[PDB]
């Protein structure tokens, strides 16, 4: 029924290619916050802004968030990426849950955010939503809270295709 | 004849079962206007004896680092039980100690202090061990959610 998905726009690549990764939510009823962890091989892929090419560093947020962006509910966005371990670690959370609940309307389906990946090396690799040191006791490195601050569980996590070198 | 007061203290958020003993222990409980105090054990249990028998009305001051402090009034004499293991007195995490000092309010100030230490771990310059509120080995969305849950004093 519900899921968090990681999508790649391209999976068969040559060196110099830029892969766009998109994190999406589906049927995530009452969601007021989310944390996602994207694990990649930093030797093979470089995390970049998919429009400017600027490399991600520790504080860099996922680009173009759709869900959890209502100004009236006081969105709190943060990232503590570990670029050397190849981890993107992003969290976004509303602070005014009472205003959000009163609306009755759930940010259940839409884009969490995006990150690009520049291909550095001609090698088969994987980009996955995956538990890291940032996210113990998680759902495949995803943490979701509802508008009462309780963990949302029971959803699936959808992984993109493994990445292959164009030979 | 002296008065003894006992009870249980707990929390309202989820945590890993292995942290239970650390989460439930170390709540300070003090009889206001006296030096009669104690700390809760691994089950959240506390007991204080030797309260003057003539002291028929007293206040229990309950506190812990990063928790909203709580005053509970007690009326009675003898063996008194203020709460039970099934219906414990709840303290709210999220009144963050800032340079040694809490302000008795759960606020955006508290939220930002957690946000400051998001993603930090032992050995990091900024890491604060007791801001891992649910004691799961990470400071992340769940620790922020605990503060917002309690988002006022
Ligand atoms: Ca405070
Ligand atoms: Ca934690």
Author numbering:
A (entry chain A): 3 to 169
B (entry chain B): 7 to 159
Give verbatim lines from the article.
In addition, cellulosomes are central elements for the production of readily available sugars in the gastrointestinal tract of a variety of mammals. It is now well established that a wide array of highly ordered protein-protein interactions involving dockerin and cohesin modules (defined herein as Doc and Coh, respectively) mediate both cellulosome assembly and cellulosome cell-surface attachment. Primary scaffoldins, in addition to containing multiple type-I Cohs, have a divergent type-II Doc that binds to type-II Cohs located in cell-surface anchoring scaffoldins, providing a mechanism to tether the cellulosome to the bacterial cell envelope. In addition to ScaA, inspection of C. thermocellum genome revealed the presence of an ORF (Cthe_1806) encoding a protein comprising 2177 amino acids and containing a putative type-II Doc, which was termed CipB. Type-II Docs of primary scaffoldins ScaA and CipB in C. thermocellum possess two distinct Coh-binding surfaces that recognize different Coh partners.
ScaC2 Coh was selected, as both ScaA and CipB Docs were shown to bind preferentially to this Coh. In the complex, the ScaC2 Coh formed a typical flattened, elongated 9-stranded β-barrel with a jelly-roll topology. The XDoc dyad was modelled as one single polypeptide chain of 164 amino acids with the first 98 corresponding to the X-module and the remaining to the type-II Doc. The CipB type-II Doc (residues 99–164) formed two loop-helix F-hand motifs separated by a 23-residue linker that also forms a small helix. Both F-hand motif loops coordinated a calcium ion in a typical octahedral geometry. In the CtCohScaC2-XDocCipB complex the X-module stabilized both Doc calcium binding loops, while in the ScaA Coh-XDoc complex the X-module only interacted with the first calcium-binding loop of the Doc. Similar to what was observed in the CtCohScaF-XDocScaA complex, both helices of CipB Doc interacted with the planar surface of the ScaC2 Coh comprising β-strands 8-3-6-5. In addition, the CohScaC2-XDocCipB interacting region is predominantly hydrophobic. Only two direct hydrogen bonds were identified at the ScaC2 Coh:CipB XDoc interface: Nδ2 of Asn146 Doc and O of Phe136 Coh, and N of Leu147 Doc and Oε1 of Gln37 Coh.
